[PDB]
Amino acid sequence: QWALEDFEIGRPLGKGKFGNVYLAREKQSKFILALKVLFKAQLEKAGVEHQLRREVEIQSHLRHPNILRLYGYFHDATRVYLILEYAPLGTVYRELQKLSKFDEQRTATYITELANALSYCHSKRVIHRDIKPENLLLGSAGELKIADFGWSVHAPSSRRTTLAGTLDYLPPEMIEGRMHDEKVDLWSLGVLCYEFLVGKPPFEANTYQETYKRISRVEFTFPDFVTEGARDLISRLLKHNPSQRPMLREVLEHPWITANSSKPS
């Protein structure tokens, strides 16, 4: 169906490990979108064809305002191209670099939007497993959208692919290569809430080895300015034991969230 000829390409929107993403416009309709470019040689070398297929299958069938749309794909002997919804206000990651810290209203609103999208995902036993600021994008009204479903699976699951970069958002069961389910995304949710309010992730360290130790022991502390409500929610999500982490409805109905969010469930 679609091929490269059907699009005029524009400015680079960002870069990932495999992803090189560009603004583009379809020639006959003038529809504006984002083109995620992947190099076949690099995909084959790392052996992640299965992740690519998963990304397309899962993201094209999900429909939710807080989840980024994937419309289709094509390829041409050097490259694979994913056709995505364009997010005009950028990543949450860039916004955090701009402001250093978010206030409680901004943080609680993002958490609600995230929890709504994840509740929709989990109702199909889809778990994302790679929730972090560079994979959260912003729509034209500043609403959060989850993206990058390349690491997603159906629960329960083991891990067959090598962990690449940072350990900062991953739970103990995940880094220890044990068995895991939906509760992994709730741990990541707790890491995010902390990083939004403080400006850095709770287990951050100078080395891989020390970061691993701080995660498996759940060693974090709060600066003075973090309020009691925020501490309560965060302490509930960052539990070593998966089964002790709350349900998403409990997050959406937490008093600190309801007192500070500007959006509903």
Ligand X SMILES: Nc1ncnc2c1ncn2[C@@H]1O[C@H](COP(=O)(O)OP(=O)(O)O)[C@@H](O)[C@H]1O
Ligand Y SMILES: COc1ccccc1C1CCN(C(=O)C2CCC2)CC1
- Minimum separation from the CB atom of position 251 to ligand X (A): 24
Residue at token pair 């469930």: 265
Residues that bind ligand X (CB under 6 A): 13-14, 16-19, 21, 34, 36, 68, 84-87, 91, 134-135, 137, 147-148, 150
Between residue 11 and residue 70, which ones bind Mg ion under the rule CB under 5 A? Answer: 16
Q: Cβ distance 195 to 223 under 8 Å? A: no
Q: Label the pairing between strands 79-84 and 70-75.
A: antiparallel
For residue 232, indicate whether it is catalytic.
no
167 binds, among ligand Y, ligand X, Mg ion, none (CB under 5 to 8 A by kind): none
- Minimum separation from the CB atom of position 84 to ligand X (A): 4
Measured distance CA(233)–CA(79) in Å, rounded: 44
The active-site residue out of 130, 168, 224, 232 is: 130
User: CB-wise, 44 or 219, nearer to Mg ion?
Assistant: 44
Residue 168 assigned ligand-binding role: no
Q: Which residues pair with 184 in a beta bridge?
A: none
Residue 15 assigned ligand-binding role: no
Between residue 32 and residue 61, which ones bind ligand Y under the rule CB under 6 A? Answer: 40, 43-44, 49, 52-53, 56
Contacts of 245 (CB under 8 A, 6+ apart): 183, 186, 187, 190, 236, 237, 239
Q: Encoding tokens for residue 163?
A: 């962990």
Q: Cβ distance 114 to 192 under 8 Å? A: yes
Measured distance CA(39)–CA(76) in Å, rounded: 10
Residue 36 assigned ligand-binding role: yes
CB atoms within 10 A of CB 160: 9
Measured distance CA(256)–CA(231) in Å, rounded: 10
What x-and-dash track marks residues 108-127 binding ligand Y by CB under 6 A?
--------------------
Residue 135 assigned ligand-binding role: yes
13 binds, among Mg ion, ligand Y, ligand X, none (CB under 5 to 8 A by kind): ligand X
User: Which active-site residues does the annotation give?
Assistant: 130
Give the binding site for ligand Y (CB under 6 A).
40, 43-44, 49, 52-53, 56, 73, 75, 80
Which stretches of the chain bind Mg ion, using CB under 5 A? Answer: 16, 135, 148, 150
